[PDB]
Write a protein that binds this ligand. Structure first.
Ligand SMILES: CNC(=O)c1cc(C(=O)NC2CC2)cn(Cc2cccc3[nH]ccc23)c1=O
Length: 113
């Protein structure tokens, strides 16, 4: 019933949408941790100090790690910030990040107060 639980269920809804087939064409680079070794990105962990991905966010939601919506948002935005910091701004992964962030920001804005 409480405000924090209700706001966290909004976040869970967003999370579920970000991982849905509706957004899969652009969301898929954010499903799993960046495997820097597999992708040849041997400078990734020198540039990105706090890696984040939707699977980690989902793990933290399932483990009741997130105490409020603001904590959930900070992880989702960190994932996007990491993409914008590491990747050239003309790489498809950045375009895909932009589109998924647009989904995140517009539904997050509708959070029950
Ligand atoms: C969060 N993900 C990343 O930061 C990421 C970085 C790089 C990457 O190679 N970045 C280099 C600096 C350019 C490659 N991938 C895979 C990928 C994703 C999307 C389109 C693609 N087209 C070709 C590969 C590819 C990612 O998911």
């Amino acid at each position: 019933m409480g405000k924090l639980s209700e706001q966290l269920k909004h976040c869970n809804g967003i999370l579920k949408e970000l991982l849905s087939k509706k957004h899969a064409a652009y969301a898929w680079p954010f499903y799993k941790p960046v495997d820097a070794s597999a992708l040849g990105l041997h400078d990734y962990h020198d540039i990105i100090k706090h890696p984040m991905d939707l699977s980690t966010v989902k793990r933290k939601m399932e483990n009741r790690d997130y105490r409020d919506a603001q904590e959930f948002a900070a992880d989702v935005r960190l994932m996007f910030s990491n993409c914008y910091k590491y990747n050239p701004p003309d790489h498809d992964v950045v375009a895909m990040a932009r589109k998924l962030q647009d989904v995140f920001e517009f539904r997050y804005a509708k959070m029950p107060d």
